[model samples]
Target: ENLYFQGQRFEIQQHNETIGSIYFSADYAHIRGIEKGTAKYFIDKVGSKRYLFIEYIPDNVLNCKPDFWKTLKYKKDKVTYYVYLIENLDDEVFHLSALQDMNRIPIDIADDVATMGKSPHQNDRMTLKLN
Candidate 1:
């Protein structure tokens, strides 16, 4: 499917948002290609410890082997977004701080994801949620 942002074509991934998390999937080949440097990057972000996955396809993939970009199946080289549970929500006011833990997706990755124009809503600076 063709994805559009600001009237330009791009990739987008959809996920199901649950009470405490969001879930998405990537093709084994796409993940492997990303890990092997055959693909550049897959857009993604973290919001309140939940991950938003975006679908991205290189221009070349449309006419070739769909298997290389198919989203089902397991491969060691495939790259998948993993959400990390933040135990201390009060400890960090910024996503960057949470990224310090290896288990968490780095803030830089989130920043990159936003800049790609996939989701304009994600571009805003994050604010701490306090009750």
Candidate 2:
């Protein structure tokens, strides 16, 4: 479920609060092609542990719908975000730290998912959470 491209970073959030993030390393994906919204496997580190970051894009077979996934809350427009989770909340791993442990070339990452997604409200002065 992955590609050999320049590393890119993305921040993942929950209910407007920061949870973790994702980093795509030089890898490969078993797909016809890759594009901007293509969800690839990323090494997701949240809390003090590591987990595979799987993007639940619309067509994905898993689609983050399995019961094993405990919903990690976040909203944009009318979209509800779901993420694979651990039962223990305290064990939640922040994505940023996981990206670091792998000695990935660390770069500045946007503070929230909206900014990572290049939302209109990305700017600090823009507080309107319009749908």
Candidate 3:
């Protein structure tokens, strides 16, 4: 099923009808090629907690952090967004705080889903949503 959060999309995974994990990314067939169908796959894949994911700072992000950021860029309008997620939503680790725990350089986005468009009703044509 497709799950939406903070205006972002995530492909939710289930194990025996129960939600096991939620994946948000364009090229997330298997997190960095990690083995699928396992509970620990996420940590083995991301190296940290997964409720709060990443919200890249588009223009602020000039290059990919091969060790951290995914090489595949999810572009929309004139900016490319990097996606991340946390399996468990811990109050102590949500949003910006989550990113910091990973010791991430942190993309300082000045706006929500920082786009070339600022108008709330701005219509954007997303030609692609995958790598």
| C-alpha root-mean-square deviation, each candidate | 15.9, 15.6, 15.1
Candidate 2 per-residue lDDT, tens place, 1-131, comes to 22312254434443354323334555421221122344444333334433343344442321212322322333334433332321223323222111112123222321221222211221111011111
How big is the RMSD of model 1? Answer: 15.9
Give the TM-score of each candidate: 0.17, 0.24, 0.23
Tens-digit per-residue lDDT, 68-101, candidate 1: 2322111124444322112224533322111112
Candidate 3 per-residue C-alpha lDDT over 18-115 given as tens digits, one digit per residue, 9 for 90 to 100: 12223344423222212233111111122333222233422222122232343112333454444333333443222211121222333344222222
Clashes of each: 7, 11, 5
- Which whole-number lDDT from 0 to 100 does residue 98 have in model 3? 17
Off by over 4 Å in 2: 1-38, 57-65, 68-70, 73-82, 85-131
Q: Which 10-residue span in candidate 2 carries the lowest summed lDDT?
A: 122-131
Give lDDT for model 2: 0.30
Task: Choose 2 or 3, whichever is better by lDDT.
Answer: 2
Q: What is the clash count of model 1?
A: 7
